Short mmCIF file of N, CA and C in Angstrom, two decimals:
data_model
loop_
_atom_site.label_atom_id
_atom_site.label_comp_id
_atom_site.label_asym_id
_atom_site.label_seq_id
_atom_site.Cartn_x
_atom_site.Cartn_y
_atom_site.Cartn_z
N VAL A 299 -6.61 -41.10 -17.76
CA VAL A 299 -7.42 -39.89 -18.92
C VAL A 299 -8.53 -40.89 -19.19
N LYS A 300 -9.46 -39.66 -19.19
CA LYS A 300 -10.98 -40.62 -20.08
C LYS A 300 -11.05 -40.54 -21.27
N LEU A 301 -11.88 -41.37 -21.52
CA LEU A 301 -11.38 -41.75 -23.62
C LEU A 301 -13.29 -41.21 -24.07
N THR A 302 -13.06 -41.16 -25.06
CA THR A 302 -14.33 -40.57 -26.00
C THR A 302 -14.50 -40.79 -26.81
N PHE A 303 -15.40 -40.62 -27.94
CA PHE A 303 -15.34 -41.07 -29.14
C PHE A 303 -15.47 -39.90 -29.69
N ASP A 304 -16.35 -38.75 -30.13
CA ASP A 304 -16.46 -36.94 -30.00
C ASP A 304 -15.42 -36.39 -28.96
N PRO A 305 -14.66 -35.09 -29.08
CA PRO A 305 -14.25 -34.09 -28.56
C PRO A 305 -15.49 -33.72 -27.45
N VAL A 306 -15.35 -33.59 -26.18
CA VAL A 306 -16.43 -32.92 -25.18
C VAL A 306 -16.14 -31.66 -24.17
N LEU A 307 -17.09 -31.38 -24.09
CA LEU A 307 -16.86 -30.47 -23.05
C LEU A 307 -16.89 -30.94 -21.26
N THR A 308 -15.80 -30.33 -20.34
CA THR A 308 -15.60 -30.74 -19.16
C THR A 308 -16.43 -29.66 -18.26
N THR A 309 -17.56 -30.15 -17.60
CA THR A 309 -18.17 -29.64 -16.54
C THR A 309 -17.57 -29.33 -15.41
N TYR A 310 -17.38 -28.42 -14.53
CA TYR A 310 -16.67 -28.08 -13.61
C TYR A 310 -17.16 -27.33 -12.21
N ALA A 311 -17.27 -27.72 -11.15
CA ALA A 311 -17.16 -26.52 -9.96
C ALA A 311 -16.19 -26.42 -9.20
N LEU A 312 -15.90 -24.81 -8.87
CA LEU A 312 -15.42 -24.23 -8.46
C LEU A 312 -16.38 -23.51 -7.27
N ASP A 313 -15.45 -23.86 -5.72
CA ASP A 313 -16.02 -23.12 -4.39
C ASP A 313 -15.00 -22.90 -3.49
N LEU A 314 -15.20 -21.35 -3.26
CA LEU A 314 -14.24 -20.72 -2.91
C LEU A 314 -14.70 -21.03 -0.63
N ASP A 315 -15.28 -21.82 -0.53
CA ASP A 315 -15.27 -22.77 0.78
C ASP A 315 -16.11 -21.56 1.79
N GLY A 316 -16.52 -19.99 1.50
CA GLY A 316 -16.50 -19.18 2.41
C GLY A 316 -15.26 -18.09 2.28
N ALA A 317 -14.03 -18.33 1.61
CA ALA A 317 -13.46 -17.06 1.65
C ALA A 317 -13.62 -15.75 1.41
N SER A 318 -12.59 -15.30 2.52
CA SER A 318 -13.10 -13.48 2.78
C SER A 318 -12.43 -12.58 2.24
N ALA A 319 -11.34 -13.07 1.83
CA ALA A 319 -10.74 -11.94 0.90
C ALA A 319 -9.20 -12.41 0.12
N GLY A 320 -8.35 -11.35 -0.95
CA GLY A 320 -7.36 -12.19 -1.57
C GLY A 320 -8.08 -12.87 -2.72
N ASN A 321 -7.23 -13.29 -3.62
CA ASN A 321 -7.23 -13.23 -4.93
C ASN A 321 -6.69 -15.30 -5.27
N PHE A 322 -7.68 -15.49 -6.41
CA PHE A 322 -7.40 -17.14 -7.03
C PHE A 322 -6.76 -16.71 -7.99
N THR A 323 -6.36 -18.16 -8.74
CA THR A 323 -6.21 -17.96 -9.89
C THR A 323 -6.38 -19.44 -10.64
N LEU A 324 -6.78 -19.41 -12.11
CA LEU A 324 -7.12 -20.46 -12.69
C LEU A 324 -6.05 -20.55 -14.19
N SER A 325 -6.02 -22.14 -14.28
CA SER A 325 -4.99 -22.35 -15.21
C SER A 325 -6.02 -23.49 -16.47
N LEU A 326 -5.98 -23.30 -17.34
CA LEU A 326 -6.53 -24.23 -18.62
C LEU A 326 -5.38 -24.91 -19.41
N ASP A 327 -5.33 -26.42 -19.50
CA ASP A 327 -3.76 -27.02 -20.48
C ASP A 327 -2.75 -26.32 -19.65
N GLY A 328 -2.75 -25.73 -18.07
CA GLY A 328 -1.53 -25.12 -17.86
C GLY A 328 -0.91 -24.28 -18.25
N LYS A 329 -1.57 -23.27 -19.24
CA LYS A 329 -2.00 -21.79 -19.54
C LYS A 329 -2.22 -21.23 -18.09
N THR A 330 -1.70 -19.84 -17.43
CA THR A 330 -2.39 -19.35 -16.63
C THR A 330 -3.26 -17.84 -16.56
N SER A 331 -4.40 -17.94 -15.78
CA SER A 331 -4.94 -16.54 -15.83
C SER A 331 -4.14 -15.37 -15.19
N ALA A 332 -4.63 -14.48 -15.28
CA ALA A 332 -4.57 -13.33 -14.13
C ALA A 332 -4.76 -13.50 -13.01
N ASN A 333 -4.65 -12.77 -12.02
CA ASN A 333 -5.50 -13.13 -10.41
C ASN A 333 -6.92 -12.59 -10.67
N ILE A 334 -7.32 -13.49 -9.82
CA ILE A 334 -9.39 -13.68 -9.88
C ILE A 334 -9.97 -13.32 -8.45
N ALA A 335 -10.36 -11.93 -7.79
CA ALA A 335 -10.93 -11.54 -7.00
C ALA A 335 -11.94 -12.64 -6.37
N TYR A 336 -12.09 -12.83 -5.14
CA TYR A 336 -12.81 -13.73 -4.06
C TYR A 336 -14.20 -13.77 -4.46
N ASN A 337 -14.87 -12.44 -4.86
CA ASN A 337 -15.92 -12.03 -4.75
C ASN A 337 -16.15 -11.51 -6.47
N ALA A 338 -15.24 -12.15 -7.70
CA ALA A 338 -15.59 -11.40 -9.41
C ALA A 338 -16.88 -11.79 -9.33
N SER A 339 -17.63 -11.38 -10.74
CA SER A 339 -18.83 -11.63 -10.80
C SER A 339 -18.40 -12.74 -11.57
N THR A 340 -19.68 -13.72 -12.06
CA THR A 340 -19.91 -14.50 -13.02
C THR A 340 -19.66 -14.22 -14.24
N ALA A 341 -20.09 -13.32 -15.06
CA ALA A 341 -19.81 -12.44 -16.24
C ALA A 341 -17.80 -12.40 -16.12
N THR A 342 -17.51 -11.96 -15.04
CA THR A 342 -16.17 -11.48 -14.98
C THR A 342 -15.11 -12.76 -15.42
N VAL A 343 -15.73 -14.07 -14.50
CA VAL A 343 -15.08 -15.41 -14.46
C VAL A 343 -14.79 -15.83 -15.22
N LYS A 344 -16.02 -15.81 -17.21
CA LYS A 344 -16.01 -16.23 -18.23
C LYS A 344 -15.11 -15.01 -19.10
N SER A 345 -15.44 -13.73 -18.41
CA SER A 345 -14.49 -12.91 -19.12
C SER A 345 -13.05 -12.85 -19.06
N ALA A 346 -12.08 -13.75 -17.94
CA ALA A 346 -11.22 -13.76 -17.53
C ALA A 346 -10.69 -14.97 -18.73
N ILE A 347 -11.17 -16.26 -18.29
CA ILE A 347 -10.80 -17.63 -18.72
C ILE A 347 -11.12 -17.34 -20.75
N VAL A 348 -11.63 -16.94 -21.19
CA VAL A 348 -11.59 -16.41 -22.92
C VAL A 348 -10.17 -15.81 -23.23
N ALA A 349 -9.66 -15.12 -22.30
CA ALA A 349 -8.20 -14.72 -22.86
C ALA A 349 -7.10 -15.52 -22.58
N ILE A 350 -7.26 -16.41 -22.33
CA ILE A 350 -6.11 -17.76 -21.82
C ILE A 350 -5.75 -18.55 -22.71
N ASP A 351 -5.90 -19.40 -23.17
CA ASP A 351 -5.67 -20.39 -23.90
C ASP A 351 -5.76 -20.02 -25.64
N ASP A 352 -4.89 -20.27 -26.79
CA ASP A 352 -4.80 -20.32 -27.61
C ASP A 352 -5.81 -20.58 -28.50
N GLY A 353 -6.94 -20.17 -29.39
CA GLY A 353 -7.81 -20.49 -29.96
C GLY A 353 -9.63 -20.69 -29.39
N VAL A 354 -9.07 -20.43 -28.02
CA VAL A 354 -10.32 -20.74 -27.02
C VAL A 354 -11.27 -19.28 -27.18
N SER A 355 -11.99 -19.74 -27.77
CA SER A 355 -13.35 -18.53 -28.25
C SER A 355 -13.91 -18.39 -26.91
N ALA A 356 -14.81 -17.56 -26.73
CA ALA A 356 -16.10 -17.15 -26.13
C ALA A 356 -17.19 -18.09 -26.51
N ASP A 357 -17.23 -18.39 -27.27
CA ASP A 357 -18.84 -19.38 -28.60
C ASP A 357 -18.25 -20.62 -27.42
N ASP A 358 -17.36 -20.99 -26.59
CA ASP A 358 -17.05 -22.70 -26.12
C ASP A 358 -16.96 -22.54 -24.63
N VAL A 359 -16.47 -21.55 -24.24
CA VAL A 359 -16.53 -21.35 -22.92
C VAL A 359 -17.86 -20.66 -22.27
N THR A 360 -18.42 -21.07 -21.35
CA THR A 360 -19.63 -20.95 -20.55
C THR A 360 -19.67 -21.07 -19.01
N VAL A 361 -19.90 -20.17 -18.38
CA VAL A 361 -20.15 -20.57 -16.74
C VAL A 361 -21.94 -20.16 -16.15
N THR A 362 -21.55 -20.64 -15.37
CA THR A 362 -22.68 -20.10 -14.14
C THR A 362 -22.67 -20.54 -13.18
N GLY A 363 -23.28 -19.66 -12.14
CA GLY A 363 -23.06 -19.62 -10.47
C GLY A 363 -22.95 -18.19 -10.15
N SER A 364 -22.67 -18.01 -8.53
CA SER A 364 -22.75 -16.76 -7.98
C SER A 364 -21.14 -16.86 -7.08
N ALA A 365 -21.53 -15.49 -6.32
CA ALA A 365 -19.92 -15.04 -5.76
C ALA A 365 -19.72 -16.37 -4.72
N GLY A 366 -18.47 -16.35 -5.02
CA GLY A 366 -17.37 -17.82 -4.67
C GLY A 366 -18.20 -19.48 -5.07
N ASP A 367 -19.04 -19.75 -5.85
CA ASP A 367 -19.83 -20.82 -6.40
C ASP A 367 -20.02 -20.23 -7.34
N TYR A 368 -18.73 -20.99 -8.02
CA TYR A 368 -19.53 -21.19 -9.96
C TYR A 368 -18.95 -22.41 -10.57
N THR A 369 -20.06 -22.82 -11.29
CA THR A 369 -19.77 -23.87 -12.54
C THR A 369 -19.56 -23.42 -14.07
N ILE A 370 -18.30 -24.08 -14.39
CA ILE A 370 -17.60 -23.91 -15.49
C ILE A 370 -18.01 -24.80 -16.49
N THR A 371 -17.97 -24.76 -18.20
CA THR A 371 -17.84 -25.64 -19.02
C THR A 371 -16.59 -25.28 -19.23
N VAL A 372 -15.85 -26.56 -19.91
CA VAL A 372 -14.86 -25.72 -20.98
C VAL A 372 -14.34 -27.09 -21.60
N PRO A 373 -13.38 -26.58 -22.82
CA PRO A 373 -13.16 -28.10 -23.43
C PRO A 373 -11.87 -28.78 -23.10
N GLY A 374 -10.97 -28.11 -22.68
CA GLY A 374 -9.51 -28.40 -21.50
C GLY A 374 -9.49 -29.15 -20.57
N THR A 375 -9.07 -29.20 -20.16
CA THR A 375 -8.41 -29.41 -18.41
C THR A 375 -7.96 -28.42 -17.42
N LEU A 376 -9.19 -27.76 -17.17
CA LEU A 376 -9.04 -26.57 -16.17
C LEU A 376 -8.63 -27.28 -14.40
N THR A 377 -7.75 -26.47 -14.18
CA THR A 377 -7.24 -26.44 -12.43
C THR A 377 -7.16 -25.20 -11.88
N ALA A 378 -6.76 -25.05 -10.51
CA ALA A 378 -7.06 -23.77 -9.96
C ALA A 378 -5.64 -23.68 -9.15
N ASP A 379 -4.82 -22.60 -8.43
CA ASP A 379 -4.22 -22.29 -7.60
C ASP A 379 -4.99 -21.23 -6.63
N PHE A 380 -5.33 -21.46 -4.90
CA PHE A 380 -6.10 -20.49 -4.40
C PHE A 380 -5.03 -19.73 -3.84
N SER A 381 -3.54 -19.83 -3.44
CA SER A 381 -2.64 -19.14 -2.89
C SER A 381 -2.57 -17.70 -2.93
N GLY A 382 -3.00 -16.74 -1.81
CA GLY A 382 -3.10 -15.61 -2.08
C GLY A 382 -4.73 -15.20 -1.75
N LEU A 383 -5.69 -16.30 -1.55
CA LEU A 383 -6.71 -16.04 -1.16
C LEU A 383 -6.84 -16.40 0.68
N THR A 384 -7.60 -15.70 1.12
CA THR A 384 -7.25 -15.63 2.73
C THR A 384 -8.76 -16.23 3.28
N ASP A 385 -8.52 -16.90 4.50
CA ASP A 385 -9.97 -18.06 5.08
C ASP A 385 -10.22 -19.24 3.86
N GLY A 386 -9.44 -19.52 3.25
CA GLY A 386 -9.94 -20.41 1.81
C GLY A 386 -9.11 -20.89 1.66
N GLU A 387 -8.37 -21.74 2.48
CA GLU A 387 -7.40 -22.79 2.59
C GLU A 387 -8.33 -24.29 2.35
N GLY A 388 -10.01 -24.05 2.91
CA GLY A 388 -10.80 -25.40 2.50
C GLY A 388 -11.40 -24.86 1.08
N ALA A 389 -10.92 -24.32 0.22
CA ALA A 389 -11.86 -24.02 -1.40
C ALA A 389 -11.51 -24.76 -2.02
N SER A 390 -12.11 -25.16 -3.24
CA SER A 390 -12.10 -26.75 -3.81
C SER A 390 -12.32 -26.65 -5.60
N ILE A 391 -11.81 -27.14 -6.80
CA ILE A 391 -11.85 -27.16 -8.12
C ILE A 391 -12.25 -28.87 -8.08
N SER A 392 -13.57 -29.32 -8.67
CA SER A 392 -13.64 -30.82 -9.38
C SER A 392 -14.28 -30.58 -10.66
N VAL A 393 -14.42 -31.92 -11.05
CA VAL A 393 -15.12 -32.56 -12.32
C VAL A 393 -16.00 -32.47 -11.78
N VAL A 394 -17.64 -32.57 -12.47
CA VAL A 394 -19.06 -33.09 -12.02
C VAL A 394 -19.81 -33.70 -13.30
N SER A 395 -20.69 -34.67 -13.00
CA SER A 395 -21.54 -35.09 -13.60
C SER A 395 -22.51 -34.52 -14.28
N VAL A 396 -23.32 -35.16 -15.09
CA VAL A 396 -24.59 -34.43 -15.56
C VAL A 396 -25.34 -34.16 -14.39
N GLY A 397 -26.46 -33.31 -14.40
CA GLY A 397 -27.14 -32.87 -13.10
C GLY A 397 -28.00 -31.85 -13.30
N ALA B 349 -1.10 -12.27 -29.02
CA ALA B 349 -2.46 -12.54 -28.75
C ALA B 349 -3.53 -12.00 -29.87
N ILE B 350 -3.09 -12.59 -31.08
CA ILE B 350 -3.72 -12.31 -32.35
C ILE B 350 -5.18 -13.48 -32.20
N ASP B 351 -4.42 -14.80 -31.31
CA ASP B 351 -5.89 -15.88 -30.82
C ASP B 351 -6.47 -14.93 -29.59
N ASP B 352 -7.88 -15.54 -29.58
CA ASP B 352 -8.69 -14.87 -28.28
C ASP B 352 -7.96 -14.87 -26.99
N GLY B 353 -7.46 -15.84 -26.77
CA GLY B 353 -6.37 -16.49 -25.83
C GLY B 353 -4.88 -15.76 -26.17
N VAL B 354 -4.49 -16.51 -25.12
CA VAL B 354 -2.46 -16.16 -25.56
C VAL B 354 -2.48 -16.45 -26.61
N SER B 355 -1.06 -16.48 -27.94
CA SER B 355 -0.21 -16.53 -28.60
C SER B 355 1.44 -16.42 -28.73
N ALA B 356 1.63 -17.19 -29.18
CA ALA B 356 3.35 -17.06 -28.88
C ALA B 356 4.46 -15.93 -29.03
N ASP B 357 5.01 -15.92 -28.00
CA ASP B 357 6.05 -14.65 -27.49
C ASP B 357 7.22 -14.92 -27.97
N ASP B 358 7.79 -16.07 -28.34
CA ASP B 358 9.40 -16.10 -29.17
C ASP B 358 8.87 -15.52 -30.54
N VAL B 359 8.22 -15.26 -30.95
CA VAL B 359 7.51 -14.54 -32.03
C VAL B 359 8.91 -12.91 -32.14
N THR B 360 9.48 -12.87 -32.89
CA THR B 360 10.13 -11.89 -33.51
C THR B 360 10.36 -11.05 -34.25
N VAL B 361 10.54 -9.27 -34.59
CA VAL B 361 10.27 -8.75 -35.22
C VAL B 361 11.29 -7.65 -35.68
N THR B 362 12.12 -7.25 -37.16
CA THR B 362 13.02 -6.89 -37.41
C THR B 362 12.49 -5.46 -38.96
N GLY B 363 14.07 -4.84 -39.54
CA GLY B 363 13.03 -4.49 -40.27
C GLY B 363 12.47 -2.73 -40.17
N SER B 364 12.40 -2.46 -40.70
CA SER B 364 11.55 -0.47 -40.08
C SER B 364 10.55 0.05 -41.41
N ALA B 365 9.58 1.01 -40.81
CA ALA B 365 8.83 1.68 -41.82
C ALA B 365 8.09 0.91 -42.14
N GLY B 366 7.58 -0.14 -41.78
CA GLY B 366 6.18 -0.79 -42.68
C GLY B 366 6.89 -2.13 -43.63
N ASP B 367 8.11 -2.50 -43.74
CA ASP B 367 9.29 -3.31 -44.53
C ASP B 367 8.95 -4.66 -43.73
N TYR B 368 8.19 -4.59 -42.35
CA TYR B 368 9.23 -5.61 -41.62
C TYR B 368 9.48 -6.53 -41.31
N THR B 369 10.71 -7.53 -41.16
CA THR B 369 11.18 -8.83 -41.22
C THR B 369 10.85 -9.33 -39.94
N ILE B 370 9.49 -9.70 -39.93
CA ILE B 370 8.41 -10.61 -38.90
C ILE B 370 9.23 -12.05 -39.56
N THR B 371 9.50 -12.67 -37.86
CA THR B 371 9.67 -14.28 -37.93
C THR B 371 8.88 -14.39 -37.00
N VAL B 372 7.77 -16.24 -37.62
CA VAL B 372 6.44 -16.33 -36.55
C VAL B 372 6.75 -18.02 -37.18
N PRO B 373 6.01 -18.32 -36.48
CA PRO B 373 5.78 -19.75 -36.63
C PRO B 373 4.51 -20.21 -37.94
N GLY B 374 3.99 -21.13 -38.74
CA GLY B 374 3.11 -21.70 -38.93
C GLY B 374 2.78 -20.81 -40.50
N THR B 375 1.61 -20.17 -40.29
CA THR B 375 1.27 -19.57 -41.45
C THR B 375 1.09 -18.19 -41.74
N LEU B 376 1.45 -16.83 -42.21
CA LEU B 376 0.94 -15.64 -42.14
C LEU B 376 0.73 -14.80 -43.25
N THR B 377 -0.89 -14.19 -42.93
CA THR B 377 -1.18 -13.08 -44.33
C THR B 377 -1.93 -11.71 -43.75
N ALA B 378 -1.79 -10.87 -44.45
CA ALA B 378 -2.40 -9.65 -44.05
C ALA B 378 -3.70 -8.71 -44.54
N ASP B 379 -4.55 -8.04 -44.67
CA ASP B 379 -5.49 -6.88 -44.74
C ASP B 379 -4.83 -5.46 -44.83
N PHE B 380 -4.61 -4.75 -45.77
CA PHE B 380 -4.28 -3.63 -46.05
C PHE B 380 -5.60 -2.58 -46.21
N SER B 381 -6.23 -3.03 -46.79
CA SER B 381 -7.93 -1.97 -46.85
C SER B 381 -8.16 -1.27 -45.86
N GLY B 382 -7.78 -1.11 -44.42
CA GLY B 382 -7.93 -0.16 -43.84
C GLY B 382 -6.47 1.06 -43.94
N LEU B 383 -5.97 0.80 -44.77
CA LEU B 383 -4.51 1.94 -45.11
C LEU B 383 -5.12 2.52 -46.48
N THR B 384 -5.13 3.99 -46.61
CA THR B 384 -5.67 4.42 -47.38
C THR B 384 -4.79 4.74 -48.92
N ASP B 385 -3.63 4.75 -48.63
CA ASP B 385 -2.13 5.08 -49.93
C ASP B 385 -1.40 5.07 -49.31
N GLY B 386 -0.50 5.00 -50.32
CA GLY B 386 1.36 4.56 -50.02
C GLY B 386 1.48 3.06 -50.62
N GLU B 387 0.45 1.98 -50.94
CA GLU B 387 0.77 0.92 -51.92
C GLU B 387 1.32 0.15 -51.93
N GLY B 388 2.70 0.09 -50.97
CA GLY B 388 3.73 -1.00 -50.94
C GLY B 388 3.23 -2.19 -50.31
N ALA B 389 2.00 -2.53 -50.19
CA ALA B 389 1.06 -3.19 -49.46
C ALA B 389 1.24 -4.67 -50.18
N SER B 390 2.18 -5.43 -49.06
CA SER B 390 2.92 -6.75 -49.99
C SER B 390 2.82 -7.55 -48.37
N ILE B 391 3.24 -9.03 -48.70
CA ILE B 391 3.79 -10.02 -48.17
C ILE B 391 4.93 -10.97 -48.25
N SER B 392 6.08 -11.24 -48.01
CA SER B 392 7.23 -11.72 -48.84
C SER B 392 8.05 -12.81 -48.10
N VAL B 393 8.82 -13.62 -48.46
CA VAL B 393 9.74 -14.70 -47.63
C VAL B 393 11.40 -14.26 -47.99
N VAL B 394 12.25 -14.47 -47.14
CA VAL B 394 13.38 -14.51 -47.37
C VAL B 394 14.27 -14.93 -46.25
N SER B 395 15.47 -15.73 -46.56
CA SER B 395 15.73 -16.61 -45.80
C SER B 395 17.60 -16.97 -45.65
N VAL B 396 18.40 -16.07 -46.67
CA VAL B 396 19.78 -15.64 -46.31
C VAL B 396 20.27 -14.99 -45.39
N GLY B 397 19.54 -14.07 -44.94
CA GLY B 397 20.09 -12.76 -43.77
C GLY B 397 20.47 -11.66 -44.20
#
């Protein structure tokens, strides 16, 4: 666990590594999303995430990127499961620095 | 889904016809200004079943 004075938003990169069909999933503090499409829009990814966790307003979440390559800033521990994505066993999600 | 995300699903509701015996975590309140007439608009606590 990283320790900070104030609470802080965590920056992530989500990368589908050229996955061609099927669906992935996201989880925030272990609360699960519905299924997400391999080319879902950047605004669709935000509009999904805001529906997952108690109290998590569309004010605090934000997302930017392109189909198959998304960067996400969110207050909780974000995680993913790619089971049901295809050509996508190389996909990844990771925490990212300032940049 | 009273939260913007998920909210507690072990919440259970009994009673009938507006009187409903809701059981919930935390604290609850209501707004009846969207309902025009009938005027029974209330909330109350009960313990003996």
